[PDB]
Enzyme design. Structure first.
Site, PDB file in Angstrom:
ATOM      1  N   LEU A  16       0.828  -1.199   0.000  1.00 33.49           N
ATOM      2  CA  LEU A  16       0.000   0.000   0.000  1.00 33.49           C
ATOM      3  C   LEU A  16       0.865   1.254   0.000  1.00 33.49           C
ATOM      4  CD1 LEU A  16      -2.721  -1.064   2.606  1.00 33.49           C
ATOM      5  CD2 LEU A  16      -2.909  -1.115   0.110  1.00 33.49           C
ATOM      6  N   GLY A  17       1.393   1.619   1.162  1.00 36.60           N
ATOM      7  CA  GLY A  17       2.225   2.803   1.311  1.00 36.60           C
ATOM      8  C   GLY A  17       3.673   2.415   1.555  1.00 36.60           C
ATOM      9  N   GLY A  19       7.107   4.250   2.931  1.00 30.79           N
ATOM     10  CA  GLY A  19       7.676   5.408   3.578  1.00 30.79           C
ATOM     11  C   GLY A  19       9.111   5.174   4.024  1.00 30.79           C
ATOM     12  N   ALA A  20       9.667   6.207   4.661  1.00 31.77           N
ATOM     13  CA  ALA A  20      11.041   6.123   5.141  1.00 31.77           C
ATOM     14  C   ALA A  20      11.151   5.195   6.344  1.00 31.77           C
ATOM     15  CB  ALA A  20      11.563   7.518   5.487  1.00 31.77           C
ATOM     16  N   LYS A  39       1.748  -3.175   9.113  1.00 31.32           N
ATOM     17  CA  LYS A  39       2.873  -2.245   9.065  1.00 31.32           C
ATOM     18  C   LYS A  39       4.118  -2.968   9.566  1.00 31.32           C
ATOM     19  CE  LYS A  39       3.995   2.570  10.093  1.00 31.32           C
ATOM     20  NZ  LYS A  39       3.479   3.828  10.698  1.00 31.32           N
ATOM     21  N   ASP A 128       2.961  16.592  11.380  1.00 34.29           N
ATOM     22  CA  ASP A 128       2.751  16.528   9.938  1.00 34.29           C
ATOM     23  C   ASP A 128       1.323  16.082   9.664  1.00 34.29           C
ATOM     24  OD1 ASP A 128       3.541  16.225   6.997  1.00 34.29           O
ATOM     25  OD2 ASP A 128       3.028  14.152   7.505  1.00 34.29           O
TER      26      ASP A 128
HETATM   27  N1  LIG Z   1      -4.186   2.043   7.821  1.00 36.58           N
HETATM   28  C1  LIG Z   1      -3.906   2.287   6.421  1.00 36.58           C
HETATM   29  N2  LIG Z   1      -4.753   1.724   5.448  1.00 36.58           N
HETATM   30  C2  LIG Z   1      -4.495   1.951   4.083  1.00 36.58           C
HETATM   31  O1  LIG Z   1      -5.378   1.367   3.103  1.00 36.58           O
HETATM   32  C3  LIG Z   1      -5.239   1.533   1.711  1.00 36.58           C
HETATM   33  C4  LIG Z   1      -6.154   0.938   0.767  1.00 36.58           C
HETATM   34  C5  LIG Z   1      -6.007   1.117  -0.643  1.00 36.58           C
HETATM   35  C6  LIG Z   1      -4.944   1.887  -1.182  1.00 36.58           C
HETATM   36  C7  LIG Z   1      -4.758   2.087  -2.740  1.00 36.58           C
HETATM   37  C8  LIG Z   1      -4.037   3.469  -2.822  1.00 36.58           C
HETATM   38  C9  LIG Z   1      -3.611   3.865  -4.256  1.00 36.58           C
HETATM   39  C10 LIG Z   1      -4.294   3.000  -5.311  1.00 36.58           C
HETATM   40  F1  LIG Z   1      -3.564   1.811  -5.559  1.00 36.58           F
HETATM   41  F2  LIG Z   1      -4.078   3.542  -6.613  1.00 36.58           F
HETATM   42  C11 LIG Z   1      -5.777   2.709  -5.104  1.00 36.58           C
HETATM   43  C12 LIG Z   1      -6.008   2.051  -3.727  1.00 36.58           C
HETATM   44  C13 LIG Z   1      -4.045   2.465  -0.245  1.00 36.58           C
HETATM   45  C14 LIG Z   1      -4.181   2.298   1.188  1.00 36.58           C
HETATM   46  C15 LIG Z   1      -3.238   2.904   2.193  1.00 36.58           C
HETATM   47  O2  LIG Z   1      -2.277   3.588   1.756  1.00 36.58           O
HETATM   48  C16 LIG Z   1      -3.406   2.727   3.638  1.00 36.58           C
HETATM   49  C17 LIG Z   1      -2.543   3.303   4.663  1.00 36.58           C
HETATM   50  C18 LIG Z   1      -2.771   3.098   6.031  1.00 36.58           C
HETATM   51  C19 LIG Z   1      -1.839   3.713   7.139  1.00 36.58           C
HETATM   52  O3  LIG Z   1      -2.153   3.623   8.358  1.00 36.58           O
HETATM   53  O4  LIG Z   1      -0.755   4.308   6.773  1.00 36.58           O
END
Ligand SMILES: Nc1nc2oc3ccc(C4CCC(F)(F)CC4)cc3c(=O)c2cc1C(=O)O
EC number: 2.7.11.1
Length: 604
Positions: A16-17, A19-20, A39, A128
């Site tokens: 999904l994400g 990061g650093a 994570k 942030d």
């Molecule tokens: N708890 C969290 N759930 C998260 O669910 C996510 C579910 C889907 C996606 C995709 C993002 C870009 C795409 F592929 F084009 C279309 C769907 C991203 C996330 C996500 O980045 C995320 C971060 C956290 C966090 O806590 O950082």
């Protein structure tokens, strides 16, 4: 190949994400199958993590548990999965290229404020706060629910920190305009020293700074851009909130208490839809549910320049009289398609809709995966803007037709009430001019007839000048509403959907170019599909703008120009009918001075 835990597991492809500090994968539970946000860190904690478990709030991503990975024994955080992505993902869509929808924008501000307030009650500073730190979940009712999670970024830094409420103002401006508040020419990259000079320029009340030329000036502004999709009544309430939290002076910063107070003041206001029929402008009055209608007319004046006493309101085909003390929560429920039409007896300029006139950016022939992606995003957002304005122009015309078809019936109601007062004067006239003939020292009676015959003569001139207005309010009588059905655009033309077909094709090509950018290179076969669809991206945008200007705008400006003339002819007829009705009241009392005068002599 993938990593696992005692209770969870996740594929490395379902990332999904990134990061650093760590990377977050999309994983599942080993025993239930429910999806979680896992994570895994690449590299005191056991206490500051368990204190984040008990954190339970609607606007905060729930930290479920902390487990240790199997192979590397890395600390793994099991977090709530948000399948819609982050607020940044939402702002990347072309429909929100020039700003979020107004209802969606209120959900963001409510969750962000409601989330940080709960964090301040517990004493956690976010440092942030960007759209990347704000996740989006679909609630049980279908409306979005935004949550904080990661508790920085270059574009969202305070000028003193560049060397808390700042990044919140940049996020709200980004969510409202679809763009950043402080943008140099070549973007905040090599013009980074320009970006710092833009923030240290601290224009206080101004909120924007656009360097539209390389090493040129900085175009400041205190108001939101014209492309902003928020209502004018919301921009008036949102602008001071941002301007007072976007200057480095701690002496002039608001702090959370004044911030939370003024933001709570905005969210506690209900919406009253009002369409200025004479100006052809739709408005939204943000008024508290406990305010009186006097303050309501004040806000209508500050948005339409219509005097409060002259505001005559129509609703559902009838007049609407607002008592000056009637609370706003007792007003009739209004929508964008069923507002409270406001008309005034004073002549008003016909303005229409004001929007930013944007053209298609030129398409480059260079085969650049990053260039074609950034190009496809801007050009698709332009068509979304032209598709947004097209539906707004269609709504304005359809609201105009209902307000005109109603106002003619309201005037025909004022005409029919004048007939009632006419029959009262005619019956009194005849039963007094002939009751004298029956009884019929000569001067006391001859003076009455020289005055009674003057009344019946001027009363008849009212009758002739009234049946003329009845002939004007008749079909085809130089005031019919038939031209409104035969001038502008209609939902039968289906112009909004014709643009929406080309918009979906451009968005699919955009989403494909968004996938083509992730892949570093394409095969020879996929390369020519990327080039062939890049040319179709231009033909689709060209076909849309041609149909937008040569059909939607032309028919709209023809309907608007025809509306400006019909307003004058309507204002002229209202002044005549008012004079003719006043000429029925003053003579209704002039026959009251003679019905009791000589008809009742004195004698024992
Ligand atoms: N708890 C969290 N759930 C998260 O669910 C996510 C579910 C889907 C996606 C995709 C993002 C870009 C795409 F592929 F084009 C279309 C769907 C991203 C996330 C996500 O980045 C995320 C971060 C956290 C966090 O806590 O950082």
């Amino acid at each position: 190949a993938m990593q696992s835990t005692s209770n969870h597991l996740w594929l490395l492809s379902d990332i999904l994400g990134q990061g650093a500090t760590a990377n977050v994968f999309r994983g599942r539970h080993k025993k239930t199958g429910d999806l979680f946000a896992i994570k895994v860190f690449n590299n005191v904690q056991m206490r500051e993590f368990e204190v984040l478990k008990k954190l339970n709030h609607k606007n905060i991503v729930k930290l479920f548990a902390i487990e240790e990975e199997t192979t590397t024994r890395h600390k793994v955080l099991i977090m709530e999965f948000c399948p819609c992505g982050s607020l940044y993902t939402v702002l990347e869509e072309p429909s929100n290229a020039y700003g979020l929808p107004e209802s969606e924008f209120l959900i963001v501000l409510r969750d962000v404020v409601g989330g940080m307030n709960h964090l301040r009650e517990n004493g956690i500073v976010h440092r942030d706060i960007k759209p990347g730190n704000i996740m989006r979940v679909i609630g049980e009712d279908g409306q979005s629910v935004y949550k904080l999670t990661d508790f920085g970024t270059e574009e969202y830094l305070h000028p003193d920190m560049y060397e808390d409420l700042w990044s919140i103002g940049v996020t709200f401006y980004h969510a409202a305009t679809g763009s950043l508040p402080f943008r140099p020419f070549e973007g905040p990259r090599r013009n980074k020293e320009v970006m710092y000079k833009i923030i240290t320029g601290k224009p206080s009340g101004a909120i924007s700074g656009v360097q539209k030329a390389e090493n040129g000036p900085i175009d400041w502004s205190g108001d939101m851009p014209v492309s902003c999709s928020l209502s004018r009544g919301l921009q008036v309430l949102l602008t001071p909130v941002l301007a007072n939290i976007l200057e480095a002076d701690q002496e002039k910063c608001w702090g959370f208490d004044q911030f939370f107070a003024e933001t709570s003041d905005i969210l506690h206001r209900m919406v009253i839809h009002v369409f200025s029929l004479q100006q052809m402008t739709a408005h939204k009055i943000y008024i508290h549910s406990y305010n009186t209608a006097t303050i309501f007319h004040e806000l209508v004046y500050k948005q339409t320049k219509i005097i409060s006493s002259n505001q005559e309101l129509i609703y559902e085909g009838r007049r609407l009289v607002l008592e000056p003390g009637r609370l706003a929560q007792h007003f009739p429920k209004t929508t964008e398609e069923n507002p409270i039409f406001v008309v005034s007896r004073e002549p008003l300029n016909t303005i229409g809709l004001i929007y930013e006139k944007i053209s298609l950016p030129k398409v480059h022939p260079r085969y650049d995966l990053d260039g074609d992606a950034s190009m496809a995003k801007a050009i698709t957002g332009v068509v979304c803007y032209a598709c947004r304005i097209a539906s707004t122009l269609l709504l304005y015309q359809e609201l105009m037709r209902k307000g005109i078809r109603w106002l003619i019936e309201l005037i025909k109601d004022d005409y029919n009430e004048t007939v009632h007062k006419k029959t009262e004067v005619v019956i009194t006239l005849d039963f007094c001019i002939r009751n004298i003939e029956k009884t019929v020292e000569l001067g006391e009676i001859s003076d009455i007839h020289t005055k009674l015959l003057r009344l019946s003569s001027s009363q008849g001139t009212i009758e002739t000048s009234l049946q003329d207005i009845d002939s004007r309010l008749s079909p085809g009588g130089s005031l019919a509403d038939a031209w409104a059905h035969q001038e502008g655009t209609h939902p039968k033309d289906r112009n909004v959907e014709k643009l929406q077909v080309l918009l979906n094709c451009m968005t699919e090509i955009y989403y494909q170019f968004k996938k083509d950018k992730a892949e570093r290179r394409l095969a020879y076969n996929e390369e020519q599909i990327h080039k062939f669809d890049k040319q179709k991206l231009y033909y689709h945008a060209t076909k849309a703008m041609t149909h937008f200007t040569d059909e939607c705008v032309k028919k709209y400006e023809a309907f608007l120009n025809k509306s400006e003339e019909w307003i004058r002819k309507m204002l002229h007829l209202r002044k005549q009918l008012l004079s003719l009705t006043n000429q029925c009241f003053d003579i209704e009392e002039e026959v009251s001075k003679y019905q009791e005068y000589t008809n009742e002599l004195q004698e024992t």
